[PDB]
């Protein structure tokens, strides 16, 4: 269960299935909102629970809705076994 | 002089994620903090502490 | 090292030649040279198949040892020597058994050094080892393609290749052209880069030097008549259309490697 | 530290640097 977030969008991939705020319907000034992340999490969890697999979290980016997505994924079907942060730059490339 | 060996002692000056603690959070002196920081990096280069 | 000529003559103003600083002997080993007969680009029917070849200085052929068969017998470097047949310098080796040989001189090889060949030989400069014994990441030249055939790959002045990884019975080598390809672990290579890396800095200065080197003048296709060249013809200057050879082979992008060659399975990345 | 003192110096540098570019590649 990998949640890739940013300042503009939040997407979720389980592996098998994936979801995103843009796929759910939110376009601008709403993809980085608690509602859209939970909606995308529910959209992915509808197939996650109906898959025979019941997981660890790999949240990567900083954004508003990671908690909502994790809570929705735990509530629907399987439960979040462990939320291990994988947020990753020891003075690397110039931005 | 603090040896890089036995990194369990070196972990007393580290945080939960393994970073080096600031001097104002543990007291110490400038020379002592420099020696601790030097000993930490020597352990990282010898696979005795996570990066 | 190179030497620039002062502009006392228009034919000397732009001349840059080598300094010949590493050469230690002036005459070749007599038992390893033979007189060489020149082709004018003509094959055995007497018809010229390759153009712009002919004349030049008389040359003798030096027998170069590209196999390095005497494994385990140490050799000493006697002299560094000029070779008219190739861009790099050569090195005269005396073996402990009284045999004498010539090798392509690597960069940083001096008179009095000791070289070896075989699996036992140390991975130092001038030694010839199977690729399975060469530690990963070193600079090599004179690379075999098949075991026992002799060096074919990295031979020109200054060129080198690198052994970057080994995968079973093959190793991965990055070539001077930028190609990455697999070579069998049984093949041999010599540690180090080829010497005389300043060969590319030389400038001839005049047409006579090319004539000495044995080349004849090259005519452009646009200044011929249509009966001689597809690009020829017209009144005044004309561009000639799409550039192509006398037989019409396109000269600006058409690939000519056979696209069914079995050697493609041993190439990882392409750059040619 | 009035500020207007440096404006005259900045402005004349612009005229000087622009006047040389008009004939740089102009042989």
């Amino acid at each position: 269960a990998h949640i890739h977030s940013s300042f503009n969008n939040i997407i979720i991939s389980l592996a098998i299935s994936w979801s995103s705020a843009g796929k759910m319907g939110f376009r601008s000034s709403k993809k980085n909102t608690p509602y859209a992340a939970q909606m995308a999490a529910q959209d992915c969890a509808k197939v996650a629970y109906d898959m025979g697999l019941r997981v660890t979290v790999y949240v990567k980016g900083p954004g508003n809705g990671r908690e909502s997505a994790i809570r929705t994924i735990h509530g629907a079907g399987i439960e979040v076994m462990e939320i291990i942060d994988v947020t990753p730059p020891h003075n690397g490339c110039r931005p | 002089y603090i040896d890089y060996k036995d990194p369990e002692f070196l972990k007393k000056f580290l945080n939960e994620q393994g970073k080096i603690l600031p001097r104002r959070i543990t007291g110490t002196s400038l020379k002592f903090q420099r020696r601790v920081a030097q000993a930490v990096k020597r352990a990282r280069h010898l696979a005795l502490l996570p990066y | 090292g190179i030497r620039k000529l002062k502009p006392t003559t228009p034919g000397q103003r732009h001349k840059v030649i080598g300094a010949f600083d590493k050469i230690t002997a002036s005459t070749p080993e007599k038992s390893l040279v033979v007189g060489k007969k020149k082709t004018g680009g003509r094959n055995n029917t007497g018809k010229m198949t390759m153009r712009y070849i002919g004349g030049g200085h008389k040359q003798k052929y030096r027998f170069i040892d590209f196999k390095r068969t005497k494994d385990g017998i140490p050799a000493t470097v006697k002299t560094i020597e000029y070779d008219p047949n190739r861009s790099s310098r050569i090195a005269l080796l005396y073996y402990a058994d009284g045999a004498k040989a010539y090798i392509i001189a690597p960069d940083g090889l001096e008179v009095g050094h000791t070289v070896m060949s075989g699996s036992e030989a140390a991975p130092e400069v001038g030694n010839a080892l199977p690729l399975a014994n060469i530690p990963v990441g070193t600079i090599i030249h004179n690379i075999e393609l098949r075991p026992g055939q002799g060096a074919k790959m990295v031979r020109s002045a200054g060129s080198f290749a690198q052994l970057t990884s080994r995968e079973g019975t093959y190793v991965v080598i990055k070539m001077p052209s930028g190609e990455v390809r697999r070579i069998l672990s049984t093949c041999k290579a010599t540690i180090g880069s080829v010497g005389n890396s300043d060969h590319a800095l030389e400038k001839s200065g005049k047409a006579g030097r090319s004539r000495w080197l044995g080349r004849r003048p090259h005519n452009r296709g646009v200044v011929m008549n249509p009966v001689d060249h597809p690009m020829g013809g017209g009144e005044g200057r004309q561009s000639g259309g799409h550039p192509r050879s006398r037989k019409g082979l396109y000269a600006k992008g058409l690939k000519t490697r056979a696209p069914k060659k079995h050697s493609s399975k041993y190439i990882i990345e392409r750059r040619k | 530290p009035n500020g207007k003192k440096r404006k005259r110096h900045k402005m004349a540098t612009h005229k000087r640097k622009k006047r040389l570019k008009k004939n740089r590649h102009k042989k």
């Binding site: - | 002089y1 990282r44 990066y51 | - | -």
Partner: protein, 98 residues
Amino acid sequence: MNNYETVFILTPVLSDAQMKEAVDKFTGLLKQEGAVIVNEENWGLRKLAYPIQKKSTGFYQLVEFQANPDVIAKLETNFRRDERVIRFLTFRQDKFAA
């Protein structure tokens, strides 16, 4: 004329006898240049904080010694020519550390 200590790691894929022979070869190469050996110890087969060349475990060894300040380059050349060592480091001890 100086006090050094060298700490190296050996690949776990090697056998115990192979590792012992490699350590003996390193000590013999050090003694060939001309040096004395103060001490040699084996921390042993232990895990690593992060994976080193895809294996997360190795054999830690070290040797404290005294040598002239010219054998360090020879030691480094031997370390690179041997492809059974995954990590190495060398330090100089002052009068306070020694």
